[PDB]
Amino acid sequence: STVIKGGTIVTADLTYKADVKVEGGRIVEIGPNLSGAETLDATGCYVMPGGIDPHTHLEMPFMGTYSSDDFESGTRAALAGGTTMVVDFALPSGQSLLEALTMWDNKSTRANCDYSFHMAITWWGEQVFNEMETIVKDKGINTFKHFMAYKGALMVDDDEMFSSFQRCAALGALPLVHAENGDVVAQLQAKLLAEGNSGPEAHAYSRPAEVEGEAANRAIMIADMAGCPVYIVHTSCEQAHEAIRRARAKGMRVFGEPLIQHLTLDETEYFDKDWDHAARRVMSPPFRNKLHQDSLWAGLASGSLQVVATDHCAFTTEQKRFGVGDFTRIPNGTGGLEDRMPMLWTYGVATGRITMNEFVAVTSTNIAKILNIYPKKGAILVGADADLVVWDPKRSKTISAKTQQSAIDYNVFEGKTVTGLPRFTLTRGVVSIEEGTVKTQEGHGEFVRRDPFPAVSTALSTWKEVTAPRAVQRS
Amino acid sequence: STVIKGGTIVTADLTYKADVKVEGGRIVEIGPNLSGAETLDATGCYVMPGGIDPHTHLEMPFMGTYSSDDFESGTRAALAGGTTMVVDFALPSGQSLLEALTMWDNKSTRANCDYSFHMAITWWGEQVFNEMETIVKDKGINTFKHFMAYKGALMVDDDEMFSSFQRCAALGALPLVHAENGDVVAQLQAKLLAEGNSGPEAHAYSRPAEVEGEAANRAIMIADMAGCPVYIVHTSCEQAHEAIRRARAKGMRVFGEPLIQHLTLDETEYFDKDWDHAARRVMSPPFRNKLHQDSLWAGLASGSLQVVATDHCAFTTEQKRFGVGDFTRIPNGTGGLEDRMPMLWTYGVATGRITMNEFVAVTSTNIAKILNIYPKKGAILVGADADLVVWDPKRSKTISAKTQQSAIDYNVFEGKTVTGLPRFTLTRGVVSIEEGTVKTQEGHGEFVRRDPFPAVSTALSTWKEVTAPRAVQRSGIPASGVH
Amino acid sequence: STVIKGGTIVTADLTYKADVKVEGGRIVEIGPNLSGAETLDATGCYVMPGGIDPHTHLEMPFMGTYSSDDFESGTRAALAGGTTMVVDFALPSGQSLLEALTMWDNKSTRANCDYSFHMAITWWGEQVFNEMETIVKDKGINTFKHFMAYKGALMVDDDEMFSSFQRCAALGALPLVHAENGDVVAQLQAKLLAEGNSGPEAHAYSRPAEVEGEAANRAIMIADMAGCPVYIVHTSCEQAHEAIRRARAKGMRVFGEPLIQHLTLDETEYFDKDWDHAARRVMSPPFRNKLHQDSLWAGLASGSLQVVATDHCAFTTEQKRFGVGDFTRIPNGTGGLEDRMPMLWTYGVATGRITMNEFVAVTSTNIAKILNIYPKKGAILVGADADLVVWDPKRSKTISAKTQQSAIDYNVFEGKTVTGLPRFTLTRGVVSIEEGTVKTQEGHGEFVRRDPFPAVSTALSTWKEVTAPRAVQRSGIPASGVH
Amino acid sequence: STVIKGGTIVTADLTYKADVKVEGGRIVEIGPNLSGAETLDATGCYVMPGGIDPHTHLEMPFMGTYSSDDFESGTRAALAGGTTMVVDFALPSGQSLLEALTMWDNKSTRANCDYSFHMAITWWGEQVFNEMETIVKDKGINTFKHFMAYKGALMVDDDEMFSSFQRCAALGALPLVHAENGDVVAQLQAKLLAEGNSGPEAHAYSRPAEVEGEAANRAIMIADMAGCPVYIVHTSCEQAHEAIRRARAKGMRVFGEPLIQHLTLDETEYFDKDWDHAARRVMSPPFRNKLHQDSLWAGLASGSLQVVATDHCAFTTEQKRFGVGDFTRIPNGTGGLEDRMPMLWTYGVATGRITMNEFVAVTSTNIAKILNIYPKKGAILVGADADLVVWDPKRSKTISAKTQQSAIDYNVFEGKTVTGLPRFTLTRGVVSIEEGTVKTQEGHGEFVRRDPFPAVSTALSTWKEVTAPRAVQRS
Ligand SMILES: [Zn+2]
Ligand SMILES: [Zn+2]
Ligand SMILES: [Zn+2]
Ligand SMILES: [Zn+2]
Ligand SMILES: [Zn+2]
Ligand SMILES: [Zn+2]
Ligand SMILES: [Zn+2]
Ligand SMILES: [Zn+2]
């Protein structure tokens, strides 16, 4: 067996000094003074569940093109950053959900760590309604992604979204929402181009924070009417956060996911004099005024935002240059898989903004519970997968594209110092990273099947029935 | 001339004892000890600007039939309750805005008091875009109404609304919005019918307060992006009020209009064992849980809601009964023209919930300023129209359909006691009501023309320009193309 | 050993079917198909950590008399309702904190389950400052209670509270607060008595919800300035909840504790025509308008309120009658120990308002973590104390004073039906309740020692240091003096 | 007579082109095409009610010393800035309110424009309770100022404040409150000095925004329980604003007064390397983080803050230097009388943040209505005092201590450009300023008497009676 020895265990539940013994890809024992044939030195370190990043777009077809990190490079980057599972979005074209799922299975051959998919609902009709049942009950996928923006490509309207959320409620599945008002965005994009305001910074101008706050509020109302929880992906601003807080104060089951980029980077990047510098940071929602960061961090501390992710969608500088002269043609996305946990630890844990237990909650455990795969993932418990990071709080670096795992040529965290990095990362007990030594195993990662109807969905359905309005009896 | 003698003047601006002299339809002199050829005794009374109710649907085609108060009976009802101007909604239809305007001119020939129109944008296209300019610049109408619900009948979507609001901004016009999410409401109606939940109470169940709060918050965002103020008609619940408060706290120019029905009546009317009683109150937004009333009153007192109206859209019981077995066929709407000012005075002024100056502000002056027609309307000032109510704070009645001016057979304020009623109501100096004697003059009312660009619109356009995001000047922009 | 067999384990962390093996007062093994010398049948049952109720006043000197549930009857009542630990408030007095502690040790010798204390800071000075260190470091108590009301009896002011909270921050201890404005309450009590408004309902009138919201918001500001978390006991209204939500939205470490009474009972009890019935419910904060309940439930579901408690402070009817003619002399307090978990399960879990995991979190695990005693308490984990309830979701009763464990003559939950009750309650592995058979062991309970500096306190101190405002380095600082 | 000719009248009520005729210190006629023996050219100008600044401390004894602008220099500065009335705080020592009022009458001999007083309640007891009746009914003063801070000097506690607010309710008077928690401030001051953090910037550190937000909320609750409106002086931060907004959303009668300094200046002044620069800006509440300004401006636009003032309390650099080595010894206060309307116009009206009508509302009319002296003051109506400013929207300057009316040697608005300045200022028809020509008349200003029970106070008392809880009738 392998024993991670001499460290302090940190989970979302508690912190305690103990050794961890791993065999057959599982945690088999946790206690003091354990001995195994192989020992990993965790003295001076924190031993935590491997990160789960539920928001990736590896080898994604988007905006005329394909992201430049694929399943192999994305999962390798994830492991180098202490992350041991990714959840990627399966993205249909009036194409079948089932056809899209087959294509995503094909893309994921070469995965270095385990992985699952969300299924995107990119249009609406009888076929989609029928196939959702198959995806949930037969394919081990209990989340459906909806886009309120990307008019003419991926967007659904209120009527379609309501139908889809009702279906998710019936199936015990969870709708995820990209919340921006697509009609307002499409018009503002056209207005800015018409005015000649066509540079990378005009991407930010085309979709101000109010557009995201409105769309989040609207998705929350539709999910409340449908009787399902709802998850707001990449919550970037106070307006979206306020909508979630206000819904949760009414007892609504609404989850929120700030990206590491939105916690630690800001819109002044778009004002840089160097065109490439500004275009490289174009993503949706855009980096925001720095004033919004404090709201997102408070949400992580108080439990109104539960999950930190990256929306990892990486494009080379050459790809970003597709948008010279027209910001709507710059492929949207920045990468972050490898930098998520290191940034969150240095700027969140070392500063006291979040405890170490909260750091585990928002980097693995909460999402594992939300996707109904805890304690297989997101746990340090006997019987859990041995997806583990041994975190050395003193191991430091300056983040640089010169030393990253990502296949692209820049890094939006370039020049940020982090102190606290993986000493080891294990994926089902396979030591894949030892300090700067990368020893990942292509094809090791396996698809993680998920069941519908977590406790939160079952309770909400019961409460809706208790409170359902009744006909008045008359003569 | 005619002198209104011995009263206390109350406006939104101040309260003072003075006589008011009226000549040629206008206030010509205000001061002590005035005399004229005719005298109206205002001793013990408050002399206020005539009410302006900007939310009426007189002889309106709707839900298979027409509302049963027309311009004559609605303006007569208004005058009897101290209201001297109505603003009605011209409704097209893919029919020209100009053809709808002509139709509404034709409808309004027997009006007893003055009147104007809002133009509804019930569909979107190049013709509508163009005709909006003519409506604003040539036809004296500076407001455009948008319905976010009534799917398949009057509803517009986000894309249409955003186009329309940007055109409002360009023209210096003000968008009005019926804020409920029409797509959710249509699906909830169909679901309730399929379950057999088909009675009048299911109307309320089909459109809960959350769907109004969402739509109000959405219309506000779209107006903020277009750079125009926006006006949320019939704000009925705390969720819609919260959206307005949150937007105004950000400095957004958002107006809200609680109906007198939503201040003083509640959803328990729908739970009555009598089908007719419940159906008579069916309107959209529906009467709400009584808990919401305090929020709306607090908005009047604090300035986050500025206008009290009635959405006067009256149907007889037999018209309501079109919806026996199917609440989606009950014509939606209630009447309140004659009862607005009496209810607000008894339940708001006499209770101390609002001052007399606030009462004037939310029953005439604020809407006059919002519609850019102050001080011609909503004022007691020299040069203002002599639209006046002489209000006797001791004159009392129990409201009843047996005595009402409205042409329909019931009154949603049945049995409410009011103390404080018109002694005289004057429309451009014509005494049309004298203590319960109705002496209205058909066709006396005239269309009130309105100009665009009130101060609020001009200031908001300047602030948008000051804060407009600018391009960054760069050199050596890289090569592009697909390699 | 003893094996709890065939049940479903439910903790705040997860839900799973397994047996639980207990040895020497501790959980020694969790897994399938365990066997031991003794078996408890948990088939069809949920096996959860025993409740922890951190808010009791057992044999407490108060308002001219003493509460009538003592350590024995209160811990017996707790065990009967699935609760296996109480935390009581040691109350000095200018009497030493150490003398009060000895007094409370003496009071607790017959406890049936384990117990700990909070220390109340009822006055301020050098001796208190010093003794706080000894309480934290030597006596195993890491919480200090402060009363913002009970003027002339227990109340401290802003200056005392700020000194005390800074000392809490230094010692890694957590301040608890009874948040009502005592100065306003004292003047309103005197005013109501002077007007002849002297009945039990006037207790509620003397301390309306606004006075709780204000005091909660104030204690939060003082804790934020001292750099320690703060815990708001018996959060009863939306105004106190709003203050907590607003503070947590800023990232402040603020905890809130709704009582089961305030989740499920309301001020209409005070309007009962029977004087005894109304007086029995007199407590501070009083039962509130029922509208406030939804806010508190929503706090449990969303995490802005983390702990359900009872503030168990029981008086007989004849003790309540000390206040006939003068509600300020009705001893304040109600009991709920035995009814907390049964009420919360029927009205929260069975209705879907909270999940079973949330139910565990707000009845044991959150407070265990807040008091820094998890996982010894509030856990089902190997090595944890065997404080367990085996809960039969089908076992039902109507709550009644005729069958209760509490020593007093009535029950504020009289007539409430509950479905879901303990089959077994174990305290450190001792089966003390078996289906309505009470078999408690006096003196079995022991004091639970607690350490300072939970993770939340340490992280908050670090954040305060990272953000501490720094002097600006200047040269040639000017001449001063009076010229 | 004198006719202000060719201008556009702007009041809080409306905007219209008309001439204004003045005779006997009053407006006697308003209309087109007026003629008088004397004409003031208002072509291209806006004709508005003279500003009323209800927050001044002229010749004030405070913190061991006396402010360096007295009634003559303060009222001269006010007129140069378009302001035609000041309301100063009469400040007793267990000294009688009536003795304090006599002293303030004596200080105000040399006033160039009209003036009134608020009476400060600086301690509590039977004498104070008795004298409040005399002040209201016999002395023409309907406001009482309370301090929640200045522990050991001016501070009252909750019990005293509640007693005083009940008395104000009975007398139809309005309590004003300096809202900071004095106990927390006094301790933080001592803690910072003990640490050696004793420079001017530590004044700001000693009283963070949360301390003001708490105190404002607490004053609002006490006034609600007492059944009187309440006015929160110098609302400087979002926390205080939020407390007012939340109270007003419940229907409470709460007024708020942002200073021009808090709308347009910020705490980075305290970080300046020059000791004098930083100390000169020390006042209470301190200049705040610039992020708070947007909240205050929104309040002016939406009606949740009603009155703009200056808290004019001017000290020479020599006086500010009293506090070298101990920030608690720096006299608190900055001046602003002359710069209030010019700053508010350039940064508020010219930017579109407020309309011209709102500018009149928050610079004269609202406070005139709040103090129950409208339309004598704050109006352009026939019969109103001819307190008028003819405002030239094109007349511009850079604000400088070299050209100011204030007797001190610096100006916290130094270097700010303003475009829009008085062409004329009239005080009861006396032209006291013509462009840069100052021609003020010492002793012209007269005390303005005010009556109790404005409409808002009467209505609130009625509503409290309607809602008063009743005894239950029992057998
Ligand atoms: Zn997205
Ligand atoms: Zn994405
Ligand atoms: Zn409508
Ligand atoms: Zn309508
Ligand atoms: Zn208490
Ligand atoms: Zn207690
Ligand atoms: Zn002050
Ligand atoms: Zn002051």
PDB file of C-alpha atoms and ligand atoms in Angstrom, chain A residues 55 57 145 147 150 178 233-234 284-285 311, ligand 1:
ATOM      1  CA  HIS A  55     -16.553  23.876 -15.639  1.00  0.00           C
ATOM      2  CA  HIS A  57     -14.393  23.144 -22.383  1.00  0.00           C
ATOM      3  CA  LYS A 145     -26.673  23.319 -19.307  1.00  0.00           C
ATOM      4  CA  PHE A 147     -27.505  29.355 -22.456  1.00  0.00           C
ATOM      5  CA  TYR A 150     -25.186  33.329 -27.804  1.00  0.00           C
ATOM      6  CA  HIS A 178     -25.086  30.702 -18.468  1.00  0.00           C
ATOM      7  CA  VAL A 233     -22.347  29.103 -13.693  1.00  0.00           C
ATOM      8  CA  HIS A 234     -19.553  31.779 -13.614  1.00  0.00           C
ATOM      9  CA  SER A 284     -17.941  35.698 -21.259  1.00  0.00           C
ATOM     10  CA  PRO A 285     -18.782  36.977 -18.772  1.00  0.00           C
ATOM     11  CA  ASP A 311     -14.577  27.723 -17.354  1.00  0.00           C
TER      12      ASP A 311
HETATM   13 ZN    ZN E   1     -20.816  30.365 -20.053  1.00  0.00          ZN
END
